[PDB]
Amino acid sequence: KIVLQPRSIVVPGELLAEGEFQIPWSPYILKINSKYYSTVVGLFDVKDTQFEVIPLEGSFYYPKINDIVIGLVEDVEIYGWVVDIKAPYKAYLPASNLLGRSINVGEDLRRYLDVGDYVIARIENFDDPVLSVKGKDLGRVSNGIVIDIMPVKVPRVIGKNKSMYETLTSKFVANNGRIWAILIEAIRKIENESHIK
């Protein structure tokens, strides 16, 4: 078991380590017969005996269950709402979920959520992502700014022990690569220097 690199900037096909590590499957690391290569432009990190690649690149968010996500309503279907969560997959919000009851005869139009509305919502199902707005604070975004970032950069915007979130607060980050709130410039600066200091 050997690691080839320190905290290094890494690239697709780049050999990270040789030997049998018991690494959980990652989309950022490809294992071939006891060699491990990065699959992405990223930052190689060693965590305890294991290691990872922190992707520095990626416009898309990958859906995960129970992620608090903030999405943009795209279409209003007969039984629900089609929602953009910046993923390869369009999320769907059942009307029955939002309402907490049956969709009544000729009921609604776009009064709860319209096209162009932002929604804060959790991912109730994904194996297309089905959303839920059950929890508190979830629902249509009435006010403020919704700033867009690389979803890949979200952990850096929050920071270990909220340390980055706190230094922006005194001067809501979703998993989605979207933050409901100049705050914009400081976030773009963390996007463009996540790999530094």
Measured distance CA(62)–CA(88) in Å, rounded: 7
CB of 12 to other proteins, least distance (A): 4
The enclosing H or E element of 98 equals: helix 95-99
**Considering only residues 98-137, where is the footprint of other proteins by CB under 8 A?**
114-118
CB of 194 to its own copies, least distance (A): 30
Contact between 9 and other proteins by CB under 8 A: the answer reads yes
Nearer to its own copies, 57 or 114 (CB): 114
Contact between 23 and other proteins by CB under 8 A: the answer reads no
- 3-state SS, residue 46: strand
Neighbouring residues of 80: CB distance < 8 A, sequence distance ≥ 6: 92, 93, 94, 95, 96, 97
Place of tokens 């279907």: 77
Contact between 105 and its own copies by CB under 8 A: the answer reads yes
CB neighbourhood size of 23 (10 A): 16
Q: Note whether 180 and 148 are within 8 A (CB).
A: no
Task: Using CB under 8 A, list all residues that contact its own copies.
Answer: 65, 105-109, 125-127
Task: Using CB under 8 A, list all residues that contact other proteins.
Answer: 9, 11-15, 27-28, 30, 32, 37, 39-41, 43, 55-60, 72, 74-76, 88-90, 114-118, 141, 143-146, 150, 152, 195
